[PDB]
A paper describes a structure:
The [name] (M pro) of coronaviruses plays a key role in viral replication, thus serving as a hot target for drug design. M pro is able to process polyproteins to produce several nonstructural proteins (NSPs) necessary for viral replication. The recognition site of coronaviral M pro depends on Gln at the P1 position, and no proteases in humans share a similar cleavage site. PF-00835231 is an inhibitor designed for the [name] of [name]-CoV that emerged in 2003, but its clinical trials were suspended due to the rapid disappearance of the [name] outbreak.
We then used the co-crystallization method to determine the crystal structures of several M pro mutants of [name]-CoV-2 in complex with PF-00835231. The resolutions for these structures are 1.79 Å (M pro [name] with PF-00835231)A, 1.68 Å (M pro K90R with PF-00835231), 1.65 Å (M pro M49I with PF-00835231), 1.72 Å (M pro P132H with PF-00835231), 1.64 Å (M pro S46F with PF-00835231), 1.66 Å (M pro V186F with PF-00835231) and 1.91 Å (M pro Y54C with PF-00835231), respectively. In each of these seven complex structures, each [name]-CoV-2 M pro mutant molecule appears as a dimer form, which is also the form with enzymatic activity. The interaction details between M pro [name] and PF-00835231 show that PF-00835231 interacts with several residues, including His41, Cys145, His163, His164, Glu166, and Gln189. PF-00835231 was not found to interact with Phe140 in M pro [name] or M pro P132H and was not found to interact with Thr190 in M pro mutants. In fact, the [name], K90R, and P132H mutations are located far from the PF-00835231 binding pocket. The results clearly showed that the ligand binding patterns are not disrupted by these mutations. The IC 50 value of PF-00835231 against [name]-CoV-2 M pro was 0.0086 μM, while the IC 50 value of PF-00835231 against [name]-CoV-2 M pro mutants, including K90R, M49I, [name], V186F, P132H and Y54C, ranged from 1.2 to 3.7 μM.
Author numbering:
A (entry chain B): 3 to 301
B (entry chain A): 3 to 300
The structure:
Amino acid sequence: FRKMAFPSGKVESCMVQVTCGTTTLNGLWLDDVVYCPRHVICTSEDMLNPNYEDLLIRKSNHNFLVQAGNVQLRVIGHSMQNCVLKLKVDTANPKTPKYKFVRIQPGQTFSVLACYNGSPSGVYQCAMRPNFTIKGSFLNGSCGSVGFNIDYDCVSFCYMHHMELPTGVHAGTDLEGNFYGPFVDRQTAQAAGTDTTITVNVLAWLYAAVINGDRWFLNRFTTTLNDFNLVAMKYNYEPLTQDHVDILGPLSAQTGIAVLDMCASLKELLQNGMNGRTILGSALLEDEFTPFDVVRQCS
Amino acid sequence: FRKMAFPSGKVESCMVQVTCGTTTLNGLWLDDVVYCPRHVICTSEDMLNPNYEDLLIRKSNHNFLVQAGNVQLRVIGHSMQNCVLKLKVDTANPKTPKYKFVRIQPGQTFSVLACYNGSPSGVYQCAMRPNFTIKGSFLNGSCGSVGFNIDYDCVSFCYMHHMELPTGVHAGTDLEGNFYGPFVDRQTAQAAGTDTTITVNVLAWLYAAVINGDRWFLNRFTTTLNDFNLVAMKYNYEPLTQDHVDILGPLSAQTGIAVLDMCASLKELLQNGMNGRTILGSALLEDEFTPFDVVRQC
Ligand SMILES: *[C@@](O)(CO)[C@H](C[C@@H]1CCNC1=O)NC(=O)[C@H](CC(C)C)NC(=O)c1cc2c(OC)cccc2[nH]1
Ligand SMILES: *[C@@](O)(CO)[C@H](C[C@@H]1CCNC1=O)NC(=O)[C@H](CC(C)C)NC(=O)c1cc2c(OC)cccc2[nH]1
């Protein structure tokens, strides 16, 4: 069992570099449009106190330097959708995959293709936290990197990167330019709401541990859904819904462990700690695997 | 800091499926050769005690079904090199990257592109353990999946998947078909040697902690390489080689902490534990980040 990402080839073929004067970041080239974070139009001074509509009307198409590898792409139009800039270019991307733009729900997972200067660098799996941050690995020049899922040859783009919070977690938008969470694309220190643990994902991960032979945390107790949620909320875990219980069905069916029985194990874990033992080699309870992630990897 | 796979697109364009009879696995299509595990030519029953030489003499070019997607690549030549089959096909792969075949050392990390029926399924980072297994994630149909590194748009292929041990770890070959470790490609339960901790990678991780301002564990002592190697073995840690000392060079230079000073700090952690303290947010010492991974990810 590993943290596994989608193969990144279909997205790699779409990454380009976008530059305005001194400011450079990544864009996503689909058909004849390049999508990128709108703050590419900002100078350093602009970023402190931007008026985006004001700065954009003053830009000309020839101010935008778009590079796909060695080839420059001529910008022939531009518009702004929330925090995303849409650059019309004179060439269609011949490797545009079947794709969709989706806004994901907290607790869902996606793969991140970290890019720098339009060049793909690494791929890794992230979850949208309940407080709408993501725990990513992003350096200077990573803005415009995207997150995505792949479902039978179709790429669902869900995340475009904009920001690293003082706490080292990250914040960004969907491909409609709308931030996840209460953040803004301005050069200021911003805090997120208090984070919580994604309970349904922890449970999926415990089932993964059982599937892979580690059972030490199981017990003979059970619990009602409500009494589990009482303890979970006490430890800053998200509540578990009956929808979540149903989504855990296949993993319950596979292991022969009723969902509310695994809840009783998790309750004991939260109240007792792991006593220095590990689960799937982790000293901490892991909450960035969805039930579908576990089902896909373990079957 | 977290584990990152390489972007997999250059390798995805090289994945094909190879079928003999009803037996299908994955192959790697570079120029006009497809590389794949030789046990594709086994029936379910021959895998118990296979005579690959005798099994291959019954085989002809036209018995091999090679497909890129649903498109057949006609096989025009075949040969066996150790545990891989090399199938020459009539079409040179137009997406062949710059590539090399390399045999990695224990401790080295690489990205694995897990594939099923020639269809890439996922990508993740792996380290070769000192006992020559990898802690992978593989299901039925995964054989022929490859592991690789990318250095300046050149793909270094280092692993082709063959086997899952009873303990749930994985074993395979380099792309010349030579197993890492004492494993053989037959349908038998095989055991790996007892595993050890990858000392050079733990040290790289301590340097990354230092680079990030987490340096409480730096002590006032130094050690000789030989003294350290002897104590490290008492804790089931790998001994350091001269090559290990040299690849820690850049990180030592960046932090101003001599390699042997860091070894003395690690030795104190081994003899005394962490005393409830963490390093880079972990109570456990991480050993699957190489010095290159620390440089790359910073
Ligand atoms: C993009 O590369 C920018 O084009 C960059 C990515 C981050 C740099 C380091 N790691 C990253 O993920 N983004 C930024 O620099 C953004 C730009 C905004 C949206 C205009 N800003 C921040 O991430 C940012 C600003 C501040 C800050 O101010 C003052 C104070 C504290 C944190 C902080 N983060
Ligand atoms: C390839 O897919 C096979 O072409 C398959 C991959 C493993 C299946 C489950 N997870 C995997 O990684 N490989 C095998 O089935 C190989 C085939 C050999 C090389 C001919 N065999 C094993 O991995 C294997 C056999 C046995 C065994 O016997 C009896 C007993 C215990 C473990 C075991 N593993």
